[PDB]
Subunit: 464 residues, 4 copies
C-alpha cells in the first residue's frame, strides 16, 4: 500500500460518489457531447493529445473532461474562477484518476498555484500539446511564463468572449504563439450559452444568494450583448422592472424593442468622473444592478455611492473589475452574510453596526455570479458549448501546428471559428435532445433557396 | 395643379393620407433626422429613382424623404394587396408619380411597375432603383437592359430580394451594384423580427377577429420573420409550435420555449399524404409560413389541417402556401376583402353552412400588409433610414459613369458600414427616450473600440 | 316586407351573415345551448327588450334567444360599438334591431325607444337584457308601468350591476334581476381576457403605433385594468399602473408593474402643483379602466407628453375629461374615432402643430370604438350566461305571481356555480381541453361531488 | 446559557440565522410596521401561542413580531423538510422554545409538535394556536381537549388547514373559533400564487439544475398554487400543459395560454393502465402536483412517465403523488438530500447507469420548501402580517373566557375584514415603492366607497 494517486488538489475527495451521481445524470442532459463520445471513441482522435484545461470545474466541465479522456486525451485541469468549482465535480474527476486542481473558494494565490499544477507535472513542464481555456488566464500564463512549452502545443480552444478578445489582441500584436479556435462564436455556443445560459442561471444565483423576491422590484442591467440579453430576460421573466444601459446603440435598440427602458447611470450618458454626473434619482430606485459588459468599471464608485440602500450588486461578466470592488474594500466595511454573500456598509471602513440600514449586498465578491452563487449554466445548455470544444480540440490537434515549418506557422497562426456545418450538426443533436423534429428540405426547396439539402442553410454572414 | 401622372384608387383620400403622414413623421426620427441633416446638401439632387415597395404611409415618408433630399421618383407597390390607398393618394396629390392601389390584379401589378419605368411611353431617365422583393429589378434586367446602363445602383429591401440579387451576381447577370439594406441590424433585427411581432397578430385580428389565446399555432420557419411571428402569437397566448429545416434556428426555437415539430413524420417530406403528421395538423388552429421558400404549406398539409383553421403567409411571395392547389380543387367563398373561406368539400359550389373549410388570409400574400398595415412607422423608420443612406451612397458613387474596368471592380452586393447602422440605431433609441452611455476613453481602450464606435466587429451577430 | 328596424346599410346583411356563421363556430357554449334547448323551447312566449353592443357576437346571442323561442327587439348600448354588418344581418333575418356605428347621443336614445315601442305603442315585453342599465334606467324612470309585466332583467357589465345595487339598497328596484357579470365565465373570461385581446387591437387599428418600447399608464387594475395592462405589456410596452385599491395595486406589483400615481404622493388636490409632471411627460399612452369619474383629468391632460395616445376602455366616457378638451382645445379628426387634440388653443390649429394628444373613440369604449371589441370565443362565456339567465327568469314568471310573495323573488342574484362550471366546461372543450374526472375517493377527500360544484361560492379563482 | 428549552440541528448556526433575519426584516415592511404600530400597546401581552409552521427565516420574523407584541410562543415546523436550520438556531438562541430541523423523521415531527404542547412534561398554559396545515390543531383536538378549553382561537395559514377546520366545524368537533388567514387576498393571491411562482422553479433548479426552457411540463391543478406554479415553469420557457377537475379553473388555464390535458383518456380515471394517456405522459419531462388532493399523480402515471422525468409536489401533503407505490416496487437512489432517483427496473438494487428512472424531489413533500427556501420574505410579509392581525383579533376576543352561551355564538371560522387585507396590501405596495392614488370625495361617492376603503364588496374576486 503506497501513497496512491495524489496528482490533484480538491476540497474533499469523499464528495466523489456524489459528483459521479451528478455526472451520470448530466450525461443524459448532454446528447451532443455524449454523441461525440460515442461517435469518436473508435478513431481515438485525441490519442496522444495532452490537454491543459482551465475552465470552471463544474459537473458540466466534468462531462467535457471525460469526453476528451474517452476520445484518447490526457488532461491536467484547473478552474478558471476561484468560486466556480463544484467540489463534488472536482472530487469525482480526481477520483477517476484525472489530474484536477480546483476547489470552490480559492484565494488568488491558490488559483495561480492550481493553474501551475496543470502546467508542471512532477516539478517540470508537462509535455502538453493542447490548450483548452475559458477567459485566457492559462493562455496568458503559458505565453508569459512558459513560452518554451508553446513550442510543442498544437493550438488553443478558447471558450468565452473575453478570452477570445485577449487572443485577438495577441494576434494583432504578433504575440500569439499557437493557432486558436474561437469556440465562443459558434451559434450553439454564443447564442445558447451566453444568452440562454444566463437566462437560466442569473435569477438562479440571485435567489440562492439572497432569496429576494424579484417580482415588482427595479433592476438595472449594464450591457445588452448576449449575456446582457439573457440576463435581462432572467430578471424580466421573474417580473422585475428592468432598465438596460448600453454603449452600443444597436444593442440599445434591441432592448427598447424587447420592451426595456434604456437608461444611463450618468446624466445624458456622460461619465465625467464626478459625483454630479450620476443620475442619483435613477440609482436611488434600483434594487438590483447586474454588470454584463466584459468591460471595466461599468458599476463604478460614484454609482455604488448613489445606489438605493440595500440594493443587490452582482457581476455575470468574466472578470470582477466590472464593479469597483476595490473602492468598496478600501472605504466600506464588509460583513459576510454567508459564503459568496457580503453586506457592504457605506457607513465607513472600520466596523459597522449590525443593524445599519445603509449597506449594499454584493454577490460572489463581484466574480461571475451564476457560477459563484449557483452552478452556472445547466448541462443541456453547456452541451452545445462543450460539443464545440471537443470538435475544436479534435481539429487543432489533427492540424499539428507544433510540427510545421516556421514560415507556414505564420500562415497557420490564426484565430478561427468552427465551420457552420459543424455548428449545425451540434444544433441538431441539441434539438433532438428536446424531442424536436427538424424538417428536411426537398431537392426543389433546397434548389429554391440556394442551399444543399444537408446544409449549411445560411451563409457565414447570417446573424440568426 | 395639372399633375396627372399617377394611378391611385381615390385621389380624394389624400387629405386623410396627409394627416397620417404628418403623424408618421413624428414616429420616424431617423428618417426625419436624415431629412434635416441632408436637406441643405441635396445629396440626391439629380437622382431619379424607380421605387417598388408597398405603398404604405411609411413608404410615403421614405418617398418624401428622398424627394426632400433632391430626388425625383416614380413609384409602384411591390404587392397587389399592400398599398394603403390614402398613402398612395397623398403621394399623388403631392405631385409624385405613383401607380398603386390595394387589390390590384397581377396584370395591373405588372402594369404599375411599367408605369414607373416608362414616362410618356419612353424609358424614364432613371438612374437609381429602390426595390423590395426584386420584381422591379428583374423587369429591368429582362426587359430594359439599356436603362440599367445608366442606373448607378439598386437598394434592395428584403431577404428574398437579396437572394435574387445574389443569384444574378453568381451568374454574371447582375448589371448594376446593389446595397443589401435588409442586412443592416436596424433592418433585419428590427423590421423582419419586431415588425412581424407587431403586425402579424394585428393582421389576423383584423381578418378573422379570432381569439388567439389558448389556441394551437404552427409557424413554418424560425428565421427573423419566423422568430417575430412566433412571438406575435405566443405573446397573445397561443400554444406555438415551430418547424424549421435549419437546426440552429430550431435550437433557438427550443431555447425560446417553443416545441419544434415537423409537418411530416420524422421530418421527411416525400410528397405522399401518408407522410403528413395528421394528428399534429388536425390540432392546429393557425398556420403561418415565414420561410421565403416554396410550398412549405403544401396541398397534403392543407388537406390535413383541422377544420376551420386559419392559413396565412407572412413571407414575401404567396407560393409559400399551395394556393394554386386550392384554387384548382376547392370552392372559395369571400368573407370580405383578403379573407376567404376555402371549402374542402369540392370545387363547384359550397354549402353556406359547410363546416369543412379553411380561412385563407390575403389570398396567401403577405398577411401583415394585406390584412392590416404592415410594420409600424417607428419600426419602418430604421429600414427606411437605411434605404436613404444606401440611395445616397450608390448615387454618389455614380457607377454608371465609371469606365468598364472600374465598374468591374465595383459590381457587387454590399451592406452599409456598421457605423451607419449604429447611427440609425442611435436615432431610434433616442425616439424611445433611451439614453446610450458614452464609453470613457479607458473603457474603449479596454475593449478595443473608439468612443464613437463602431462598437462590434462585423462578425458580431447581436 | 319587413320594415321594423333601422340600420346603417341593409345591404351589408350577407356579409354580416357570413361572419355570423363563422362566429357560431367560435361560440361552442352558445351553440351548445341552441342544441340543448332547441327542443324544450324554454323561451317560447318570451318577449325580450335587449340593449347591448350590436356586434357579430351579440348577433349570435340574439339568434340563440330566437332559436330557443324568444321574440326580441334590439338596440346597441354604445354609439360606436355596433358592427353595421351585424345589425344588417339581424334585421335581414326579420329581427327588429335599431343600431348603427356612429350614432349621435340623440339617435342612441331614439334606438332604445324603438325597441320599447312596437307599432307605435309599448311592446308587450316580458323580459329585459341590458348592458350598462341605460335601457333599465329608461324603463324605471319613464315606463314604470311596462315593468309590471316583465319577469326580470339580466345585466351584462360591472357598471350596470352597480346601478342595480344602488336601486336595491334604496328599494327602488322593481323587478328581479340576475347579475351575469359575477359569473367567473363572464367576469374574468370577458372583463380581463376580452380587454387583453381587444385593447392593443384597437390601439393598432386607430393609430398603427408601435407599442414595444414605449411608456403606458394604465389607470385601474380591476379585471379590465388587469387585462389592459397585459395587452400592452405583452406587446413590449413599459407599463405603469395606478390604483386606489391597495390590493389591486399589490397584484400589479406582483405581476411585474411599477405602481405610480398621476399626483405627487397620490394626493389629487385639484391643483396643477399636485401633478407629477415628470411622470406624465414620459407617458406615451394612458388607458383608463376604472368605471370611475375623471381619472384622467384636465391637469393630467395638460401635463401629458406631446403626441401621447389617450383612450378609455371603461364603460363611460367621463373617465377622461373630454369635456375640458372640447371646451379648450381644437379637435382634428384623423379618421373616424381618431382625433388629434391640439393644446395650442380652441380657435383652430396649425396642421403641423406638434403639441397635440391623440384621443381614440372620443373617450368612449376604445375596444368597441376602434376595433370589434372582444372576440367571439370570449363573448361566448358571457352570453351563454345571459341565455341561461334569461331562461331562469322567464321560466320563474315573476310577473304572474302574488303581490309581495314576489318580495322573496325581488333580488339581484347571480347564477349557480354549477351553471358557471357548465359554461366553463363548454368553453374548455372549444379549446380541445380535456377536464379530468375525480375518482370517488378523490371527491370524498376534498369534499366535493364528482359532478361539482368544485369550489365554494367564496372561492376567488 | 441556561436556556435549553428547544431542539434544533445546530445551535452554532444562530449568528448566520440572525444575519439573515436582520435582512429579512428589511424585506417585510408590513410585519415590521405591525411591530412599530403595536409595540407600545403590547396587544399580545399574556398570549401564549402554540405555533406550527415551516421554521424558515420568514417564520422567524413572524415569531419575533408576535413576541415583540407581548406574546410568548412555543414553535414547531409543519413539514419535516421545510425548516431552515439557521432560522431555527437563531430563534432558539433568542430564548424562544423551538423544536425543528430540516430532515426530520415522521416520529421526530410528531415529537416536535408535542414539545410545544407540553412544557416540563405538563400541558403548557397555551391560549392561542397558529397553525399551517391543521396538524397541531388535529393533535390538540384528538389528544388535548383540556387545553382547548383555555385556548381563544386558531389562526390557520393554508388551504388544506382551512379545509380540515371546516370539516370539524361541519361535524361539530371544532372546539375553538378560527380565522382563515389563507383567504385574505394578501395571502391567497400573494403567497399561494406568486410565492410558488418564485419558489417552484427555484426548488427545481436547486434540486436538479435541469434546463427547463424547451421542455414539457404537466402541472396537476390550476388553483392558486397551480396558477403560480404554471407561471413559474412557463416564464422559464417550459411548454406547460395543465390538468384540472374544475372546468372554471381549466377555462382560466386556456385563456392564460396553456393547453389543458388529462393524464387519463377522455379524463376518465378507471384505475387501469389502459386509461392512461401514455403518449402524452411519455412526452412529459416534469410533473408538478398542486391540488391538495390525493393520488393526483398515481402509480399508473408514474409507470407511464417519460424516462428521467422529474416528479414533484408543491401541495401541502405528500400523498398527491403515490410515493408509497414507488417505495413498494422501485429502487431509490439518493442523489443528494431531498433528491432521489427512482429506478423503475425493480425493487432490489439498480444498475448505477440505468436510464429508466424518475427524479423525485423532497420525497414528494412540498418542493419549494423542501428543495429551496419556500416563498421569499417580501411575499411572506403579507401572509404573516395577516397572521399577526388574526392572532391579535382572536386573543382580544378571549373566547375561552366567554360564557358557554356566548361561545356558541362565536364558534366559527372567520376571515379578516377586507379593510385589514387592504392595510396589509398598502404596506406591501409601499415596500415596492408603489404610490397608491387617493380617491377624491366625489370619486369615492361616484363608486359608492369610503376614501379609506374598503374599495370592493366582499364578493369581489380580484
Ligand atoms: N457568466 C457566464 O456564464 C458568462 C457566459 C458567457 C460570457 N460571459 C462573459 O460575459 C461578458 C459579456 O459576454 P458577451 O458574450 O455578452 O459579450 P458582448 O460583447 O456580446 O456584450 C457586451 C456588451 O456590453 C456593452 N458594454 C460595454 N461597455 C459598456 C458600458 N460601459 N456600459 C454599458 N454597456 C457596455 C457592449 O456594448 C456590448 O454590447 C464577457 O466577459 C464574457 O466572457 C459570462
Ligand atoms: N411580411 C413582412 O413584413 C416581411 C418582412 C421581412 C421579410 N419578409 C420576407 O419573409 C421571408 C423570410 O424572411 P427572413 O428574413 O425571416 O428570412 P430567413 O432566411 O432569416 O428565415 C427563413 C427561414 O425559413 C426556414 N425555412 C426554409 N425552408 C423551410 C421549410 N421548408 N420548413 C421550415 N422552415 C424552413 C429557413 O431555415 C430560415 O431560417 C422572406 O421572403 C422575406 O423577404 C417579409
Ligand atoms: N370595454 C369593455 O369591453 C369592458 C368590459 C367589461 C367591463 N368594462 C367596464 O370597464 C370598467 C371597469 O370594469 P372592471 O370589471 O375592471 O371593474 P373593477 O371594479 O373590477 O375595477 C376597476 C378598478 O378601478 C380602480 N379605480 C377606481 N378609481 C380609480 C382611480 N381614481 N385611480 C385608479 N384606479 C381607480 C378600482 O380600485 C378598481 O380596482 C367598468 O366601467 C366596466 O363596465 C368594459
Ligand atoms: N407549497 C406552498 O408554498 C404552498 C402555498 C400555499 C398552499 N399550498 C398548498 O397547495 C395546495 C393547493 O392550494 P391552493 O391554494 O392552490 O388550493 P386551490 O383550491 O386554490 O386549488 C387546488 C386545485 O386542484 C384542483 N384539483 C383537485 N384534484 C385534481 C385532480 N385530480 N386533477 C387536477 N386538478 C385537481 C382543484 O380543482 C383546484 O382548483 C393545498 O394543499 C395548499 O395548502 C402550498
Ligand atoms: N408598413 C410597411 N411599409 C412598407 N414596407 C413594409 N414592409 C413591412 N411593413 C411595411
Ligand atoms: N364583441 C362584443 N360584443 C358584444 N358586447 C361586447 N362587449 C365587449 N366586446 C363585445
Ligand atoms: K403601418
Ligand atoms: K369581435
Ligand atoms: K425564503
Amino acid at each position: 500500500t503506497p501513497a496512491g494517486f495524489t496528482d490533484y488538489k480538491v476540497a474533499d475527495i469523499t464528495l466523489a460518489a456524489w459528483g459521479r451521481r451528478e455526472l451520470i445524470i448530466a450525461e443524459s442532459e448532454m446528447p451532443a457531447l455524449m454523441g461525440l463520445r460515442r461517435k469518436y471513441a473508435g478513431q481515438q482522435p485525441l490519442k496522444g493529445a495532452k490537454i491543459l484545461g482551465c475552465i470552471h470545474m463544474t459537473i458540466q466541465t466534468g462531462v467535457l473532461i471525460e469526453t476528451l479522456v474517452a476520445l484518447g486525451a490526457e488532461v491536467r485541469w484547473s478552474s478558471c474562477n476561484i468560486f466556480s468549482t463544484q467540489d463534488q465535480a472536482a472530487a469525482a474527476i480526481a477520483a477517476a484518476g484525472i489530474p484536477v486542481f480546483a476547489w470552490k473558494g480559492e484565494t488568488e494565490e491558490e488559483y495561480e498555484w492550481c493553474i501551475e499544477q496543470t502546467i508542471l507535472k512532477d516539478g517540470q513542464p508537462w509535455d502538453a500539446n493542447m490548450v483548452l481555456d475559458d477567459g485566457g488566464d492559462l493562455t496568458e500564463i503559458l505565453h508569459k511564463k512558459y513560452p518554451q512549452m508553446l513550442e510543442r502545443i498544437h493550438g488553443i480552444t478558447e471558450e468565452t468572449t473575453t478570452g477570445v478578445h485577449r487572443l485577438l489582441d495577441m494576434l494583432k500584436n504578433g504575440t500569439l504563439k499557437v493557432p486558436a479556435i474561437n469556440v465562443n462564436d459558434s451559434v450553439t455556443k454564443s447564442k445558447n450559452d451566453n444568452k440562454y445560459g444566463c437566462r437560466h442561471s442569473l435569477n438562479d444565483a440571485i435567489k440562492r444568494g439572497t432569496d429576494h423576491l424579484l417580482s415588482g422590484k427595479q433592476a438595472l442591467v449594464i450591457g445588452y450583448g448576449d449575456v446582457g440579453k439573457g440576463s435581462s430576460q432572467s430578471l424580466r421573466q421573474e417580473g422585475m422592472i428592468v432598465k438596460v444601459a448600453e454603449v452600443d446603440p444597436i444593442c440599445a435598440m434591441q432592448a427598447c424593442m424587447d420592451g426595456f427602458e434604456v437608461v444611463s447611470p450618468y446624466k445624458n450618458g456622460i461619465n465625467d468622473g464626478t459625483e454630479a454626473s450620476i443620475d442619483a434619482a435613477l440609482l436611488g430606485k434600483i434594487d438590483l444592478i447586474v454588470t454584463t459588459t466584459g468591460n471595466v468599471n461599468v458599476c463604478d464608485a460614484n454609482m455604488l455611492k448613489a445606489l438605493k440602500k440595500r440594493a443587490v450588486v452582482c457581476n455575470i461578466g468574466h472578470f470582477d473589475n466590472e464593479i469597483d470592488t476595490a473602492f468598496m474594500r478600501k472605504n466600506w466595511a464588509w460583513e459576510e452574510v454567508k459564503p459568496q454573500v457580503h453586506k457592504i456598509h457605506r457607513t465607513g471602513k472600520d466596523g459597522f453596526d449590525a443593524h445599519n440600514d445603509d449597506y449594499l449586498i454584493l454577490l460572489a465578491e463581484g466574480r461571475l455570479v451564476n457560477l459563484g452563487n449557483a452552478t452556472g449554466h445547466p448541462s443541456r445548455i453547456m452541451d452545445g458549448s462543450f460539443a464545440n470544444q471537443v470538435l475544436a480540440q479534435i481539429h487543432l490537434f489533427e492540424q499539428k501546428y507544433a510540427d510545421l515549418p516556421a514560415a507556414e506557422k505564420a500562415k497557420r497562426l490564426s484565430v478561427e471559428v468552427l465551420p457552420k456545418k459543424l455548428d449545425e450538426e451540434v444544433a441538431l443533436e441539441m434539438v433532438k435532445g428536446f424531442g424536436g423534429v427538424v424538417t428536411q428540405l426537398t431537392p426543389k426547396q433546397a434548389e429554391y433557396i440556394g442551399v444543399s439539402v444537408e446544409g449549411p442553410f445560411k451563409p457565414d454572414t447570417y446573424r440568426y
